[PDB]
Amino acid sequence: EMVETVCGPVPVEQLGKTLIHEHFLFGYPGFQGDVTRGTFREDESLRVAVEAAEKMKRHGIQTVVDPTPNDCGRNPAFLRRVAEETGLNIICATGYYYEGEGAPPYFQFRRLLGTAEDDIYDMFMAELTEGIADTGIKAGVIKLASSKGRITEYEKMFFRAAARAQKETGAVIITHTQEGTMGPEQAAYLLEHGADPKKIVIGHMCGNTDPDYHRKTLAYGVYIAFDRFGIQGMVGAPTDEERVRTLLALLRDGYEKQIMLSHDTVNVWLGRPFTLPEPFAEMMKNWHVEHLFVNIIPALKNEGIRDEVLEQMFIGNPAALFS
Amino acid sequence: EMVETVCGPVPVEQLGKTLIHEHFLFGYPGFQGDVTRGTFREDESLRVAVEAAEKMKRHGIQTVVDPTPNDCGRNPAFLRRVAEETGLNIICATGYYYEGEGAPPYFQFRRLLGTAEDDIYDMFMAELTEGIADTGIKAGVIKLASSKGRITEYEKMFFRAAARAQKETGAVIITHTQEGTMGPEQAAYLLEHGADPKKIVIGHMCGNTDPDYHRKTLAYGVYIAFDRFGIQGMVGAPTDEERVRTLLALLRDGYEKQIMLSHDTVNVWLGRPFTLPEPFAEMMKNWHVEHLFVNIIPALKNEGIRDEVLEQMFIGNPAALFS
Ligand SMILES: [Co+2]
Ligand SMILES: [Co+2]
Ligand SMILES: [Co+2]
Ligand SMILES: [Co+2]
Numbered sequence: 001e002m003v004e005t006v007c008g009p010v011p012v013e014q015l016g017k018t019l020i021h022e023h024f025l026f027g028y029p030g031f032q033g034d035v036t037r038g039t040f041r042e043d044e045s046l047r048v049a050v051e052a053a054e055k056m057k058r059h060g061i062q063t064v065v066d067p068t069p070n071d072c073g074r075n076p077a078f079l080r081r082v083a084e085e086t087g088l089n090i091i092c093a094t095g096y097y098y099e100g101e102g103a104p105p106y107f108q109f110r111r112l113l114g115t116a117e118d119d120i121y122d123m124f125m126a127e128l129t130e131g132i133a134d135t136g137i138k139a140g141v142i143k144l145a146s147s148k149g150r151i152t153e154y155e156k157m158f159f160r161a162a163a164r165a166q167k168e169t170g171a172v173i174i175t176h177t178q179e180g181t182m183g184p185e186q187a188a189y190l191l192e193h194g195a196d197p198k199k200i201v202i203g204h205m206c207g208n209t210d211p212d213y214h215r216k217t218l219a220y221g222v223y224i225a226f227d228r229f230g231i232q233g234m235v236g237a238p239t240d241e242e243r244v245r246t247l248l249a250l251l252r253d254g255y256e257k258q259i260m261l262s263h264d265t266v267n268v269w270l271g272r273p274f275t276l277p278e279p280f281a282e283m284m285k286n287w288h289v290e291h292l293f294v295n296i297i298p299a300l301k302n303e304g305i306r307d308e309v310l311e312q313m314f315i316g317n318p319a320a321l322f323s
Numbered sequence: 324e325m326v327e328t329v330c331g332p333v334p335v336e337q338l339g340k341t342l343i344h345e346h347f348l349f350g351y352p353g354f355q356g357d358v359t360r361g362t363f364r365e366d367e368s369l370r371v372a373v374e375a376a377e378k379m380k381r382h383g384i385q386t387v388v389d390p391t392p393n394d395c396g397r398n399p400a401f402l403r404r405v406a407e408e409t410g411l412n413i414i415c416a417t418g419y420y421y422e423g424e425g426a427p428p429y430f431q432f433r434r435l436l437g438t439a440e441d442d443i444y445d446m447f448m449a450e451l452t453e454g455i456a457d458t459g460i461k462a463g464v465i466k467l468a469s470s471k472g473r474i475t476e477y478e479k480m481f482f483r484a485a486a487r488a489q490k491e492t493g494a495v496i497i498t499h500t501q502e503g504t505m506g507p508e509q510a511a512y513l514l515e516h517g518a519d520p521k522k523i524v525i526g527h528m529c530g531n532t533d534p535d536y537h538r539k540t541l542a543y544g545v546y547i548a549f550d551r552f553g554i555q556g557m558v559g560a561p562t563d564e565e566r567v568r569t570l571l572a573l574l575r576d577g578y579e580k581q582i583m584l585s586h587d588t589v590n591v592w593l594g595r596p597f598t599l600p601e602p603f604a605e606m607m608k609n610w611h612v613e614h615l616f617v618n619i620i621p622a623l624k625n626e627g628i629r630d631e632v633l634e635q636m637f638i639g640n641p642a643a644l645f646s
Contacts, residue, residue, distance in 0.1 A: 030429030106353030
């Protein structure tokens with residue numbers, strides 16, 4: 001009945017239209033070391049994040065899940081300023097990123113000491129049930145992430161701790177899959193450890209363009225997310241045209257009660273600014289929070305997808321996920 | 324001639340007795356994600372750090388080089404409080420740790436963009452000549468680090484950028500070698516890119532117990548540091564008995580003008596506290612800032628090492644290094 005947002009508990013029935021995966025802030029681990037040339041400018045960053053929230057609201061979005069990992073610059077107090085300013089519900093995560101682009105040395109060291117997995121569970125419980133740091137904000141989701149072609153020994157500690165914490169709390173799990181791999185394996189591994197499929201979203205499933213891989217994942221009874229619309233050419237991503245093709249195949253198969261959509265935007269980058277060289281910059285030009293509404297949903301309706309199906313994905317599914 | 328300390332420029336002739344490698348604070352990358360259970364308690368940490376500084380002062384230390392990497396919790400403003408409270412000269416570093424236990428995703432991403440190496444050089448120059456973040460503090464050394472048996476392509480970006488910054492500034496370079504590997508290779512690679520051997524300290528050389536390896540490094544004209552006294556068993560480290568044996572062999576050969584000593588202490592760990600299991604805790608019991616003075620130096624004196632050679636290593640060498 002309630003879910004924890006950065007402004008406290010909100011009834012699940014009031015979440016309304018939701019984007020299941022976007023970042024207001026994000027940095028690659030190591031951004032902290034480039035603080036001199038890459039300082040976090042609070043005022044300007046807040047203006048940018050607020051403008052992003054305002055754009056989302058213009059398209060009827062009432063709730064965003066921001067699954068920024070703990071080791072990637074997660075800042076709940078900043079998210080609260082955005083929500084307090086805009087009235088958008090923002091739900092944040094507890095979790096670490098995958099080994100390949102995360103910051104594994106700290107918990108790798110605790111693994112060597114023999115405490116890491118219990119420590120991770122302790123962290124999850126604290127952040128889900130007590131609060132993050134001194135912010136008073138509880139996470140509403142656990143974020144998990146795996147590597148390309150395998151769930152590493154490091155990552156599996158977090159998967160196990162997540163299943164444990166979920167059993168205790170009923171918290172939703174949101175995942176990252178890398179380059180269209182491990183969707184089935186993530187679902188299997190979590191359910192093998194007692195997690196509830198109706199509380200799991202296997203993420204970045206748009207990264208794979210073979211609909212049998214999606215069907216295999218969907219057979220576990222989990223949610224999947226096509227959550228990187230607008231990301232093309234980069235991080236091994238297929239095109240939006242390929243995402244749409246794959247998505248249409250599944251909707252025409254009747255899977256709409258298991259699918260959610262999003263962009264995985266990064267609205268403010270932590271660390272030093274950068275510009276993408278061509279041709280990448282042109283390929284990435286639609287990576288923004290209005291793209292689903294301006295471009296993708298019209299293309300879906302232009303291929304016969306009806307409003308009730310879209311509403312199932314954006315409103316119905318988040319309501320069920322968090323219930 | 325001056326060197327930049329956390330309190331501003333200090334004449335090199337006033338550095339006096341120096342510990343070339345100690346950490347007041349240090350965290351394994353990822354510690355930031357465990358903020359809820361592993362919070363930074365600034366008062367208590369300052370008290371602990373000040374107490375370490377007072378211990379060093381009692382053995383006549385006036386200056387400490389703290390080469391904590393930028394991605395391992397470096398905190399120049401905290402160091403300044405330690406210095407202000409104690410009158411100790413503290414010199415800090417600019418640099419990133421080795422790939423294996425650092426936070427490489429950030430600059431790996433910039434490498435994809437084509438700018439990483441130039442960005443690293445720019446960071447070095449900013450921090451050596453302008454200031455770190457908004458603290459007004461300049462670094463007095465560049466910290467470099469390599470992996471076990473390899474200077475990786477990520478690491479070499481920093482090595483090349485350091486040689487470049489050193490040519491422009493005359494800055495001192497201090498390095499980390501992993502598990503007694505790559506000393507000769509580091510010296511050779513830096514020299515190949517125009518760095519000045521009289522401004523280079525190859526660190527953790529006590530990690531290798533074969534004096535031939537030391538002489539190969541010494542042949543480049545660089546300083547070497549036996550800087551992990553008291554670390555035994557962990558991190559592949561030899562015993563202090565082995566360190567001393569190796570050091571005496573080199574002092575027999577007359578290399579004292581290229582050698583410096585330290586402990587590489589971590590006086591305050593960032594993140595959540597931990598306990599070492601026995602047997603390691605017992606092996607590690609002498610890892611503290613007084614060990615060189617209470618235990619090691621007296622053993623060297625027992626063996627007939629003259630005060631002038633000890634003074635060369637602790638006073639003469641740092642003066643020459645920074646001149
Ligand atoms: Co992701
Ligand atoms: Co994401
Ligand atoms: Co080191
Ligand atoms: Co060190």
